[PDB]
């Protein structure tokens, strides 16, 4: 027997964990805020980290690793890869990026390499000529990001258009980084918009601005086999080589950076956590990375495959129980 | 990286090694905080020792 | 030199007490009867450990040492122990019953009944001194006496010794090893009440000494004579400097100055290393590279919590034994770059270091093992806050269904000072945060 | 000296009182004539508790014994240990109290009581630091019921101050066949709910369950009742008796169990359990200890603690076990059944080891629950109290000793509410 609470209720990632833990047996869930549990499903929010790991008697595990959110907030994210030996101008897979406050940031170095074809982006807002773009962030309050737009992107056929991809990595308390090999291409219904791009939806591929405008994906979710059927047919490859290496190479890059910080080999408490990594192909088939989602949704399709693997993975590995779907990436 | 005020004993050393810059009461209202509890509670008991006499 | 006088409140404080003041004896070469033939003025003396202890003409060093607990048990060990003749009676104070682990009837009932002649026995103390520095005040947060008779001291010594300073080392609560479930409450309480009157608090919770004893010294169910050896190694690393010869940390003051910016985030954050069982069949010596390493490793904290998430405003290095500067340099050199050590802007990234080429001293027979280098590092870090917040989550639980709560205000004391006292430490919560708001 | 003095009133309180006089008295090394013969420093060291010194190194309970009729004392002056009372401190009438509280309480106790008190009195001025006072009697009796707590509400007056601890025996209809038992334990209970700061329910119902299912004797006497009882009242206080952290005065046990004054009623529990004169072939292993004494058939009080929810709780063992193996026991019980634990008291459940096992055994494990679970007995009680009350049944035995009706209903109330109360905190 082993006891859990969840804390975090919107979850339909750990909804599912939580109903299969449950659908075994071996797993009893506690009232939220009764101490005395293995696996903290923690909040979103102020999780109450220093509470953990001080219950004797008791090995905990909980959900998220402290201190990954500065891998997973666009303003940090851009603070952690400039400022940090091993990414740094060293990097190639990162849009050219820069911090910025709604009057130590960047509104002036921004204008500098500015002085050049520019197109950028911030809910959000993408231009061409500076000045609106520092009034949009000026408008607003919170902190905000400006990279250069990704003005050619590779577009899908049939259609012209554009897509992002999603990869969700699960990272163990050991530290293992593990890749489900099923991910999914967040495409666009409307052809994607050379000429003029202030209008958005065909742009932005997000599934909620697109399922609220758009035929060729149910869901505009294109999946690995059908996007690697197709890039053998239209470009005479593999996403395998076009692609994954270069993902794994981004994914094993990150996490590696702040490993340092984050770990809990010796640590009173464990972590694990699930990761999403959102990534935009090129043109010329050269991955850039986009954002990391420190609490990421699954698709629905896929649901049933990655929350059994986190239970395996990453909660019976520690406390076990009474042909993998999932790429260790290899460090 | 810099050492400074580096001193030596017979008993050892100490120094400094920077990396890097930067960038009341009284005793009389002792007594009344005191008196006033020793007073919350005299009176709790004589309710005591009230209800026990009825 | 300055003497300071130790206060030993309550169990904890006297037995904590009484293991420094036994390792102190061995430290400096005295016997069970305060003669000590290394020192050759009989009679007296400025050295450096007559900030420790007084002279006698008979030939007598005797502690500074003021014991008091509110009943007899544990200090009548120390009347009747192996050490009674290194204290004179008018410094071992007890009393009749004791204060039920209420923090009401340690400061409130009992105290008021006591204060007086324990301040008398302190004034006694200062009397004999030249130039007395301040206090170093032992006692438990959990219990009666060491929470609610230690914080009515304190507000007393502030207003008869205004000039003086205030260490404390204070015994954090447990539950492997707790005798009380209000623990909680006496501990906000007395922190509460004693924030403004303590200078520098050097916090050690049972749980991270009970572990290092499990762990690294192989015993099974540490007792209190397990923690409190310890116990009395840390505490005698941080006091080495105010006995014997050096220039850092050469008084109370500094603790102070070095350690705290702000006063009421005066609670440092203490690490040692090594601890190695004396069973251990022959042992790889470790390095200074290795030792300093170890500062920096959650499991030798004397407070469990993560350095990463939160700044530093101040680290010291305390060395005992077989170290010089190039290595200590060499090592923070290393860990410069494999550790997450990121300090408040407002403060120069350094360590302040200390060296005495003795090594620690092991009390023969005990569970440590004999090595040829030690150190004990206090940084003030803001991750010592975790201690807080899950003390006050505690308290939360309980006392919002005032639970017990009867047994306290049942000794005069207000439901109000209860939420006064958390208020406050809400407060100082908010405090820490700010300080390390950066990632 | 945190000296206590000892109480026992009436059959049931006397007969209890005597054998809690003669196991701990072994458990010592005092024999009849009251002179230590222990083979051990531990069992003199806090041997004042309970005991009294005089000339030739004799030791005497701190003990007082009253009854309203003269039976009893006799039984218990030609007893085992019948000696070594102080003389003086038998206080006995002779009319009797007829199973009923009113004369206990008002008529004939109220004649006997201030000779009771003047031992009590007398027993006190002669303290160091006089921890409280602990009395044995029963509450469906006249005697030890009605004069029983009479005698707590006088001692609460003299001494306000002091700890009141009682041994409160709890009648049950499956042990004894007087109508009226339902009446002097709700008149009982109102008292002790208002004027005791801790009471062990020592419920008939579950002693007579025990011995008649569990141990399979088929025609249980007091004695066998009686075997149970001071096997507990030896474990419940043994950390007042020997040196040790926990509990080891009546204040410190109040503190860490009492959450709420009026909620300071206790179940008790023991393992493993035996029959007078079982003998017993292997010792349990410290996981049996720990799982059995948490055992709903092992509890004093007939209750479900899977119906309540543990408040406070007390656990001592006793012989020569594992601190470790103990500590991770006790460990697993909280984690494994988290939930009978009230989340809002962290760490609720304190834990001693004493090495000197009882009378007997190798090991054995006392259990002190403060459980919302006994608001189940206070029910048995009131339903049986309800159904008589309300066609005003035998209440004349009653008024004709002076009482009122109203009387009546104030204690049926002051229970109702110490009911609907634990029902509170085991929902929060
Ligand atoms: C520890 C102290 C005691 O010794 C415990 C008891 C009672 N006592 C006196 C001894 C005694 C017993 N029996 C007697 C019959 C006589 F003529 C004279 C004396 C006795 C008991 C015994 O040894 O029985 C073999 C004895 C007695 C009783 C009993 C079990 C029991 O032992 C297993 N029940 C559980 C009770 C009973 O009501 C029921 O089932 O419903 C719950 C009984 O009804 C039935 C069976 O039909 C019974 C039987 C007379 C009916 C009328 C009045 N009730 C009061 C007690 C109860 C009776 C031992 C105190
Ligand atoms: N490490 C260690 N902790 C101790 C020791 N003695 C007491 N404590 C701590 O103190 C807590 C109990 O309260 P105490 O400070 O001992 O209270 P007291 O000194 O007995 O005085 P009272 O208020 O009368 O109980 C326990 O939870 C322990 O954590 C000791 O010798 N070593
Ligand atoms: N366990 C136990 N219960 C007893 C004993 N003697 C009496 N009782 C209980 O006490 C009740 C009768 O009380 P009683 O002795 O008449 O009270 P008294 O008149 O004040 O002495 C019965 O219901 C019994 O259940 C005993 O030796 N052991
Ligand atoms: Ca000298
Ligand atoms: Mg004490």
Request: glycine share 6%; charged share 20%; net charge negative.
């Given at each position: 027997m082993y006891t859990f609470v969840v804390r975090d209720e919107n979850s339909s990632v750990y909804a599912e964990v939580s109903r299969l833990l449950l659908a075994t047996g071996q797993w009893k869930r506690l009232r939220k805020d009764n101490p005395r549990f293995n696996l903290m499903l923690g909040e979103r929010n102020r999780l109450p980290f220093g509470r953990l790991g001080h219950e004797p008697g008791l090995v905990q595990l909980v959900n998220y690793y402290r201190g990954a959110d500065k891998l997973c907030r666009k303003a940090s994210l851009v603070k952690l890869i400039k400022t940090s030996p091993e990414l740094s101008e060293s990097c190639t897979w990162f849009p050219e990026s820069y911090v910025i406050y709604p009057t130590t940031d960047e509104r002036e170095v921004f204008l500098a390499a500015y002085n050049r074809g520019n197109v950028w982006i911030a809910g959000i807002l993408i231009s061409s000529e500076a000045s609106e773009l520092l009034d949009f962030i000026d408008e607003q309050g919170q902190v905000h990001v400006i990279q250069k737009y990704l003005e050619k992107p590779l577009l899908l056929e049939p259609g012209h258009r554009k897509f992002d991809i999603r990869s969700w990595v699960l990272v163990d308390h050991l530290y293992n980084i593990y890749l489900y090999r099923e991910g999914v291409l967040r495409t666009s219904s409307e052809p994607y918009n050379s000429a003029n791009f202030q209008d958005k939806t065909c742009h932005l591929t997000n599934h909620c601005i697109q399922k609220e405008y758009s035929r060729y994906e149910e869901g505009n979710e294109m999946f690995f086999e059908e996007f690697n059927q197709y890039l053998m047919d239209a470009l005479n490859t593999t996403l395998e080589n076009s692609i994954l290496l270069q993902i794994k190479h981004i994914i094993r890059s990150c996490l590696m950076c702040i490993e340092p910080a984050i770990s809990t080999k010796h640590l009173h408490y464990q972590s694990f956590q699930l990761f999403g990594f959102d990534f935009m192909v090129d043109e010329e088939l050269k991955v850039w990375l986009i954002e990391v989602n420190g609490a990421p949704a699954c698709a629905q399709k896929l649901y049933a495959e990655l929350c059994q693997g986190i239970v395996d993975v990453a909660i019976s590995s520690v406390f076990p129980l009474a042909t993998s779907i999932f790429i260790k990436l290899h460090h | 990286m810099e050492v400074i005020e580096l001193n030596k004993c017979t008993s050892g050393q100490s120094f400094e090694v920077i990396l890097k810059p930067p960038s009341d009461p009284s005793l009389e209202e002792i007594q009344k905080k005191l008196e006033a509890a020793e007073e919350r509670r005299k009176y709790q008991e004589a309710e005591l020792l009230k209800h026990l006499a009825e | 030199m300055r003497e300071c006088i130790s206060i030993h409140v309550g169990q904890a404080g006297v037995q904590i007490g009484n293991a420094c003041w036994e390792l102190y004896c061995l430290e400096h070469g005295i016997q069970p009867d305060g003669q000590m033939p290394s020192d050759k003025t009989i009679g007296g003396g400025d050295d450096s450990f007559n900030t420790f202890f007084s002279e006698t003409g008979a030939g007598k060093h005797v502690p500074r040492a003021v014991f008091v607990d509110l009943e007899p048990t544990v200090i009548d060990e120390v009347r009747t122990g192996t050490y009674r003749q290194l204290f004179h009676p008018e410094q071992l104070i007890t009393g009749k019953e004791d204060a039920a682990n209420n923090y009401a009837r340690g400061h409130y009932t009992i105290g008021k009944e006591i204060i007086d002649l324990v301040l008398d026995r302190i004034r006694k103390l200062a009397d004999q001194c030249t130039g007395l520095q301040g206090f170093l005040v032992f006692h438990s947060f959990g219990g009666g006496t060491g929470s609610g008779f230690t914080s009515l001291l304190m507000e007393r010594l502030s207003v008869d010794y205004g000039k003086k300073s205030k260490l404390e080392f204070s015994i954090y609560p447990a539950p492997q090893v707790s005798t009380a479930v209000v623990e909680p409450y006496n501990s906000i309480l007395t922190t509460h009440t004693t924030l403004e009157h303590s200078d520098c608090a050097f916090m050690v919770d049972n749980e991270a000494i009970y572990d290092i004893c499990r762990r690294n010294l192989d015993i099974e169910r540490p007792t209190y004579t397990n923690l409190n050896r310890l116990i009395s190694q840390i505490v005698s690393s941080i006091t080495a400097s105010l006995r014997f010869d050096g220039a850092l940390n050469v008084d109370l003051t500094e603790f102070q100055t070095n350690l705290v910016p702000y006063p009421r985030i005066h609670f440092p954050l203490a690490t040692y290393a090594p601890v190695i069982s004396a069973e251990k069949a022959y042992h790889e010596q470790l390095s200074v590279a290795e030792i300093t390493n170890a500062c920096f490793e959650p499991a030798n904290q004397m407070v469990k919590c993560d350095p990463r998430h939160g700044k530093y405003m101040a680290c010291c290095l305390l060395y005992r034994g077989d170290v010089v500067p190039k290595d200590v340099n060499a090592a923070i050199a290393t860990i410069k770059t494999k550790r997450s050590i990121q300090f408040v802007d407002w403060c120069p990234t350094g360590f302040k270091v200390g060296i005495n080429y003795q090594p620690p001293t092991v009390v023969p027979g005990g569970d440590l093992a004999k090595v040829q280098r030690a150190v004990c590092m206090l940084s003030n870090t803001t991750a010592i806050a975790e201690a807080w917040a899950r003390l006050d989550h505690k308290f939360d639980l309980m006392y919002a269904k005032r639970a017990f709560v009867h047994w306290y205000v049942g000794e005069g004391m207000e439901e109000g000072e209860f939420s006064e006292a958390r208020e406050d430490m809400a407060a100082l919560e908010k405090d820490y945060e700010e300080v390390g708001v950066d990632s | 000296?945190?000296?206590?003095?000892?109480?026992?009133?009436?059959?049931?309180?006397?007969?209890?009182?005597?054998?809690?006089?003669?196991?701990?008295?072994?458990?010592?090394?005092?024999?009849?004539?009251?002179?230590?013969?222990?083979?051990?420093?531990?069992?003199?060291?806090?041997?004042?508790?309970?005991?009294?010194?005089?000339?030739?190194?004799?030791?005497?309970?701190?003990?007082?014994?009253?009854?309203?009729?003269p039976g009893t004392m006799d039984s218990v002056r030609s007893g085992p240990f019948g000696q070594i009372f102080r003389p003086d401190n038998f206080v006995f009438g002779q009319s009797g109290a007829g199973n009923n509280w009113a004369k206990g309480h008002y008529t004939e106790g109220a004649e006997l009581v201030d000779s009771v008190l003047d031992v009590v009195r007398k027993e006190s001025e002669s303290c160091d630091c006089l921890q409280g006072f602990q009395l044995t009697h029963s509450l469906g009796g006249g005697t030890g019921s009605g004069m029983g707590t009479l005698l707590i509400s006088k001692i609460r007056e003299e001494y306000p101050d002091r700890i009141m601890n009682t041994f409160s025996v709890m009648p049950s209809p499956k042990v004894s066949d007087t109508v009226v038992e339902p009446y002097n334990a709700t008149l009982s209970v109102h008292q002790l709910v208002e004027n005791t700061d801790e009471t062990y329910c020592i419920d008939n119902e579950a002693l007579y369950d025990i011995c008649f299912r569990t141990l399979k004797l088929t025609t249980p006497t007091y004695g066998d009742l009686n075997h149970l009882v001071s096997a507990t009242m030896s474990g419940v206080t043994t950390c007042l008796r020997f040196p040790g952290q926990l509990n080891a005065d009546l204040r410190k046990l109040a503190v860490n169990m009492v959450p709420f004054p009026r909620l300071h009623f206790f179940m008790p529990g023991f393992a493993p359990l035996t029959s007078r004169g079982s003998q017993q072939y292997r010792a349990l292993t410290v996981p049996e200890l720990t799982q059995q004494m948490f055992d709903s058939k092992n509890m004093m009080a007939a209750c479900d603690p899977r119906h309540g929810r543990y408040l406070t709780v007390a656990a001592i063992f006793r012989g020569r076990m594992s601190m470790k193996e103990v500590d991770e026991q006790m460990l697993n019980v909280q984690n494994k059944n988290s939930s009978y634990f009230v989340e809002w008291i962290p760490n609720n459940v304190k834990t001693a080891v004493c090495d000197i096992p009882p009378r007997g055994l190798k090991m054995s494990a006392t259990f002190i629950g403060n459980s919302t679970a006994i608001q189940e007995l206070f029910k048995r009680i009131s339903e049986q109290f309800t159904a008589m009350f309300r066609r005003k049944a035998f209440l004349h035995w009653y008024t004709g000793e002076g009482m009122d009706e109203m009387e009546f209903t104030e204690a049926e109330s002051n229970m109702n509410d110490l009911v609907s109360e634990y029902q509170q905190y085991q929902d929060a």
């Amino acid at each position: 027997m082993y006891t859990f609470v969840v804390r975090d209720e919107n979850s339909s990632v750990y909804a599912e964990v939580s109903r299969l833990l449950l659908a075994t047996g071996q797993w009893k869930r506690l009232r939220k805020d009764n101490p005395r549990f293995n696996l903290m499903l923690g909040e979103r929010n102020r999780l109450p980290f220093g509470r953990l790991g001080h219950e004797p008697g008791l090995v905990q595990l909980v959900n998220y690793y402290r201190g990954a959110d500065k891998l997973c907030r666009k303003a940090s994210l851009v603070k952690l890869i400039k400022t940090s030996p091993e990414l740094s101008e060293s990097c190639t897979w990162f849009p050219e990026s820069y911090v910025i406050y709604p009057t130590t940031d960047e509104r002036e170095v921004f204008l500098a390499a500015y002085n050049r074809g520019n197109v950028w982006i911030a809910g959000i807002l993408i231009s061409s000529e500076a000045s609106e773009l520092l009034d949009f962030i000026d408008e607003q309050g919170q902190v905000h990001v400006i990279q250069k737009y990704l003005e050619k992107p590779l577009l899908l056929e049939p259609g012209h258009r554009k897509f992002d991809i999603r990869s969700w990595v699960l990272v163990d308390h050991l530290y293992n980084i593990y890749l489900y090999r099923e991910g999914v291409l967040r495409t666009s219904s409307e052809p994607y918009n050379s000429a003029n791009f202030q209008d958005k939806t065909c742009h932005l591929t997000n599934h909620c601005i697109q399922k609220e405008y758009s035929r060729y994906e149910e869901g505009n979710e294109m999946f690995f086999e059908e996007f690697n059927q197709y890039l053998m047919d239209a470009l005479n490859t593999t996403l395998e080589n076009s692609i994954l290496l270069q993902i794994k190479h981004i994914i094993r890059s990150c996490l590696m950076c702040i490993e340092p910080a984050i770990s809990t080999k010796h640590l009173h408490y464990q972590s694990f956590q699930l990761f999403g990594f959102d990534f935009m192909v090129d043109e010329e088939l050269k991955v850039w990375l986009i954002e990391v989602n420190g609490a990421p949704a699954c698709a629905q399709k896929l649901y049933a495959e990655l929350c059994q693997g986190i239970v395996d993975v990453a909660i019976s590995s520690v406390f076990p129980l009474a042909t993998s779907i999932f790429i260790k990436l290899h460090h | 990286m810099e050492v400074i005020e580096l001193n030596k004993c017979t008993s050892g050393q100490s120094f400094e090694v920077i990396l890097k810059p930067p960038s009341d009461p009284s005793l009389e209202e002792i007594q009344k905080k005191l008196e006033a509890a020793e007073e919350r509670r005299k009176y709790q008991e004589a309710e005591l020792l009230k209800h026990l006499a009825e | 030199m300055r003497e300071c006088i130790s206060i030993h409140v309550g169990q904890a404080g006297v037995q904590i007490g009484n293991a420094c003041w036994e390792l102190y004896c061995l430290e400096h070469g005295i016997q069970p009867d305060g003669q000590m033939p290394s020192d050759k003025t009989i009679g007296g003396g400025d050295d450096s450990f007559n900030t420790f202890f007084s002279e006698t003409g008979a030939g007598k060093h005797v502690p500074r040492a003021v014991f008091v607990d509110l009943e007899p048990t544990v200090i009548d060990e120390v009347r009747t122990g192996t050490y009674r003749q290194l204290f004179h009676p008018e410094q071992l104070i007890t009393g009749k019953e004791d204060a039920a682990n209420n923090y009401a009837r340690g400061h409130y009932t009992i105290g008021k009944e006591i204060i007086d002649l324990v301040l008398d026995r302190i004034r006694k103390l200062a009397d004999q001194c030249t130039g007395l520095q301040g206090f170093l005040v032992f006692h438990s947060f959990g219990g009666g006496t060491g929470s609610g008779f230690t914080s009515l001291l304190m507000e007393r010594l502030s207003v008869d010794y205004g000039k003086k300073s205030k260490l404390e080392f204070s015994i954090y609560p447990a539950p492997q090893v707790s005798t009380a479930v209000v623990e909680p409450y006496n501990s906000i309480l007395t922190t509460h009440t004693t924030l403004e009157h303590s200078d520098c608090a050097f916090m050690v919770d049972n749980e991270a000494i009970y572990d290092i004893c499990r762990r690294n010294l192989d015993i099974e169910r540490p007792t209190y004579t397990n923690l409190n050896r310890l116990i009395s190694q840390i505490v005698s690393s941080i006091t080495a400097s105010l006995r014997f010869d050096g220039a850092l940390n050469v008084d109370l003051t500094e603790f102070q100055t070095n350690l705290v910016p702000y006063p009421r985030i005066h609670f440092p954050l203490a690490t040692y290393a090594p601890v190695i069982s004396a069973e251990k069949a022959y042992h790889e010596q470790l390095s200074v590279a290795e030792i300093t390493n170890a500062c920096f490793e959650p499991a030798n904290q004397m407070v469990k919590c993560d350095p990463r998430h939160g700044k530093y405003m101040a680290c010291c290095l305390l060395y005992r034994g077989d170290v010089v500067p190039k290595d200590v340099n060499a090592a923070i050199a290393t860990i410069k770059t494999k550790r997450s050590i990121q300090f408040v802007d407002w403060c120069p990234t350094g360590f302040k270091v200390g060296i005495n080429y003795q090594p620690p001293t092991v009390v023969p027979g005990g569970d440590l093992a004999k090595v040829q280098r030690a150190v004990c590092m206090l940084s003030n870090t803001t991750a010592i806050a975790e201690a807080w917040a899950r003390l006050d989550h505690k308290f939360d639980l309980m006392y919002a269904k005032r639970a017990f709560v009867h047994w306290y205000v049942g000794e005069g004391m207000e439901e109000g000072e209860f939420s006064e006292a958390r208020e406050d430490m809400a407060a100082l919560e908010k405090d820490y945060e700010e300080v390390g708001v950066d990632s | 000296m945190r000296e206590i003095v000892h109480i026992q009133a009436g059959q049931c309180g006397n007969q209890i009182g005597a054998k809690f006089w003669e196991v701990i008295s072994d458990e010592h090394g005092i024999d009849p004539t009251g002179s230590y013969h222990g083979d051990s420093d531990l069992q003199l060291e806090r041997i004042n508790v309970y005991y009294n010194e005089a000339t030739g190194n004799k030791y005497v309970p701190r003990a007082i014994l009253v009854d309203l009729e003269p039976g009893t004392m006799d039984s218990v002056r030609s007893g085992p240990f019948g000696q070594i009372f102080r003389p003086d401190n038998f206080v006995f009438g002779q009319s009797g109290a007829g199973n009923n509280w009113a004369k206990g309480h008002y008529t004939e106790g109220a004649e006997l009581v201030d000779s009771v008190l003047d031992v009590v009195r007398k027993e006190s001025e002669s303290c160091d630091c006089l921890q409280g006072f602990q009395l044995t009697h029963s509450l469906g009796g006249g005697t030890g019921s009605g004069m029983g707590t009479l005698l707590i509400s006088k001692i609460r007056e003299e001494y306000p101050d002091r700890i009141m601890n009682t041994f409160s025996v709890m009648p049950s209809p499956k042990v004894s066949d007087t109508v009226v038992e339902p009446y002097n334990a709700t008149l009982s209970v109102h008292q002790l709910v208002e004027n005791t700061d801790e009471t062990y329910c020592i419920d008939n119902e579950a002693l007579y369950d025990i011995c008649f299912r569990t141990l399979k004797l088929t025609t249980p006497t007091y004695g066998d009742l009686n075997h149970l009882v001071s096997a507990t009242m030896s474990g419940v206080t043994t950390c007042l008796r020997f040196p040790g952290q926990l509990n080891a005065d009546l204040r410190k046990l109040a503190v860490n169990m009492v959450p709420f004054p009026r909620l300071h009623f206790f179940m008790p529990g023991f393992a493993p359990l035996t029959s007078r004169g079982s003998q017993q072939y292997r010792a349990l292993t410290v996981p049996e200890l720990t799982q059995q004494m948490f055992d709903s058939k092992n509890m004093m009080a007939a209750c479900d603690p899977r119906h309540g929810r543990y408040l406070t709780v007390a656990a001592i063992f006793r012989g020569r076990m594992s601190m470790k193996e103990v500590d991770e026991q006790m460990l697993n019980v909280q984690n494994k059944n988290s939930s009978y634990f009230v989340e809002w008291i962290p760490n609720n459940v304190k834990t001693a080891v004493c090495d000197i096992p009882p009378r007997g055994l190798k090991m054995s494990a006392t259990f002190i629950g403060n459980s919302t679970a006994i608001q189940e007995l206070f029910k048995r009680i009131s339903e049986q109290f309800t159904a008589m009350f309300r066609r005003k049944a035998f209440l004349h035995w009653y008024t004709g000793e002076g009482m009122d009706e109203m009387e009546f209903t104030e204690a049926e109330s002051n229970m109702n509410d110490l009911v609907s109360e634990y029902q509170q905190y085991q929902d929060a």
